[PDB]
Design a binder for this molecule. Structure first.
Ligand SMILES: C[S@@+](CC[C@H](N)C(=O)[O-])C[C@H]1O[C@@H](n2cnc3c(N)ncnc32)[C@H](O)[C@@H]1O
Ligand SMILES: C[S@@+](CC[C@H](N)C(=O)[O-])C[C@H]1O[C@@H](n2cnc3c(N)ncnc32)[C@H](O)[C@@H]1O
Ligand code: SF4
Ligand code: SF4
Ligand code: SF4
Ligand code: SF4
Lengths: 323, 317
């Protein structure tokens, strides 16, 4: 009462628990593998989760990696910290644990009792050498006993690997499951292990009309930085929200809401930045591609270096003085 | 409760004649409410202070696009959100796709569901679906879904491959058949997936009520294909207000018992009285809506539960 909308982006948060994974996908934006060492400390993650659970605005806490079910003991401990505070939880997994019917029974029982409202399973031709089809089927079939857990199947595809046979092999286990096939973002292992010809190109620089950011969503990443979104493309940029080791979530939200570059991006769209480079003939100097698989790819190539961000500084400063 | 969303089924007429159609829709379908009556309904829903979302279904709502746009423009000054479902026949022309997306975006259409599968395929070509899906990328505020109705013999595997990269970023859901309408007589029951049985207690719960003003002139408590073959209606008179429809839904004893006790309350009565075979309750079913449809698809069946529901009312409340 007597207050209008304050800060945005404070209802959800994501934590990337670790870069370690059982799989070594050739497209992995983080080049994840069993030998990946990039991660925040366990006690630091416990403090973060405790703070997010006690926070009055956060409604949803999401966990990602890496493979979050790889160290299940630690994942269940984090979920039990949240439990007395009744926050909703979302999980994403490669479903390696589907190989064991005992783990399938136990994990669904735990997710249901720990307020896990959504589980996304990632399966495609890039994941297929590391996880069997029957493991995915066991998870999808058992999810029918837990209708309150929203189940999704995310498939990362290329022109040569469209996952048509993968989806057929899953049989009727996909009935009622939301399936989304998405193109690659040229970051991490996809940059060097996938032919760029095989990456779908849906956007071009000439269609600035439809180039707007899908929306911010705070991520506390395994590199110890904080990002304004969960897109694979953002982790390659110099856009971070961390100023110190012990930063509060209220401070992260305040920084996101006062960041001038991100305010201009949300309000004016990508055309504001692209027209500044076109007007000053800098598209070739900054090696900005002409075609992209996603709007995030444009974002990635506009701010993936300090030279590029610093270039926009006088224009953003001029925008601030005018408005 | 249940007063934030409402659906209107505009007509049973369709350009398609799908073999699974829950309404047996076709170009020669004559069941519909009058246009002026629909205008009055839409005006009342637009002026209503609680309704946030108005959905349109059929039949094929884009078949008479002039009337659909007219209804959307009645809603426009009141700023309600709109959802649409279509077979995408209009996708044949990219210029027509550009026009309809421009209108949907300016008329607060927040979601568009496209239905395409092997049952829809003889009536709509693949390229028409692709044109709609590709152009939807320019309108990220419109939530795009592809819904595919499948059977064991028609799983839509080749249909999805033929769509190529037009499905990238689109939520796809394959769902089984409900044995109603044309699916009852044109599809072999062995081809209908059976996921649940009378013994799976965690599945015997209604997914939730959602008010539908249907093309038969009745009002239903949900949008499931199964409810339209039941005698569960919320209409008591021709000129009934939405406040009254909501009041009737919230005071309906059968629907209160169903939501609170689940389907096991009704099924145990029939098992205890040896009426499972008399009522033709299926042992196995593709979804819980299949049980709902078989419990309540006749006045005799509904009236059978009355003394038990009356006893429940006296014991509780
Ligand atoms: C990095 S994984 C982490 C969680 C878990 N290991 C999994 O695969 O679901 C998150 C999602 O991003 C997708 N992904 C990975 N690298 C990507 C890339 N270069 N471009 C687009 N999506 C990518 C994965 O396929 C997966 O669906
Ligand atoms: C009756 S249609 C009306 C809207 C539009 N003509 C369309 O096909 O999307 C609504 C949805 O119900 C589905 N449907 C029709 N008959 C069905 C049945 N017997 N069982 C399950 N779904 C059915 C259709 O495939 C479609 O996705
Ligand atoms: S995409 Fe997921 S499963 Fe594959 S390597 Fe990366 S983190 Fe592991
Ligand atoms: S456009 Fe940029 S900021 Fe927005 S979601 Fe994509 S990568 Fe993140
Ligand atoms: S399922 Fe939709 S397109 Fe097919 S006949 Fe029925 S109303 Fe028409
Ligand atoms: S269970 Fe019955 S009332 Fe509930 S959605 Fe299905 S048909 Fe409608």
């Amino acid at each position: 009462n007597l207050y209008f909308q304050g800060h945005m982006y404070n209802k959800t948060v994501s934590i990337n628990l670790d870069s370690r994974c059982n799989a070594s996908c050739d497209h992995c934006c983080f080049s994840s593998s069993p030998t990946s060492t990039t991660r925040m400390e366990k006690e630091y993650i416990r403090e973060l989760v405790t703070e997010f659970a006690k926070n009055k605005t956060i409604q949803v806490i999401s966990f990602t990696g890496g493979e979050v079910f790889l160290d299940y003991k630690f994942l269940k401990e984090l979920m039990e910290i949240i439990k007395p505070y009744e926050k909703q939880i979302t999980l994403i997994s490669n479903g390696f644990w589907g190989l064991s019917k005992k783990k399938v029974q136990e994990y669904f029982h735990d997710m249901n009792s720990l307020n896990v409202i959504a589980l996304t399973i990632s399966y495609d031709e890039y994941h297929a050498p590391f996880v069997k089809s029957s493991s995915i089927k066991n998870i999808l079939e058992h999810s029918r006993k837990y209708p309150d857990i929203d189940i999704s199947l995310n498939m990362a595809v290329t022109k040569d690997k469209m996952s048509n046979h993968i989806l057929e092999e899953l049989g009727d286990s996909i009935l009622g499951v939301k399936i989304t096939k998405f193109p690659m973002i040229s970051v991490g292992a996809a940059k060097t292990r996938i032919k760029q010809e095989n990456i779908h190109k849906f956007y071009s620089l000439e269609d600035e009309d439809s180039l707007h950011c899908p929306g911010y969503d705070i991520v506390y990443h395994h590199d110890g930085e904080i990002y304004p979104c969960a897109s694979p493309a953002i982790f390659e940029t110099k856009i971070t929200l961390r100023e110190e080791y012990n930063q509060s979530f209220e401070r992260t939200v305040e920084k996101l809401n006062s960041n001038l570059l991100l305010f201009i991006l949300r309000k004016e769209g990508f055309k504001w930045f692209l027209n500044i480079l076109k007007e000053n003939n800098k598209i070739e100097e900054f090696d900005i591609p002409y075609e992209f698989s996603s709007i995030c790819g444009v974002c990635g190539s506009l701010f993936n270096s300090a030279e590029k961000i610093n270039y926009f500084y006088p224009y953003m400063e001029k925008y601030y003085n005018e408005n």
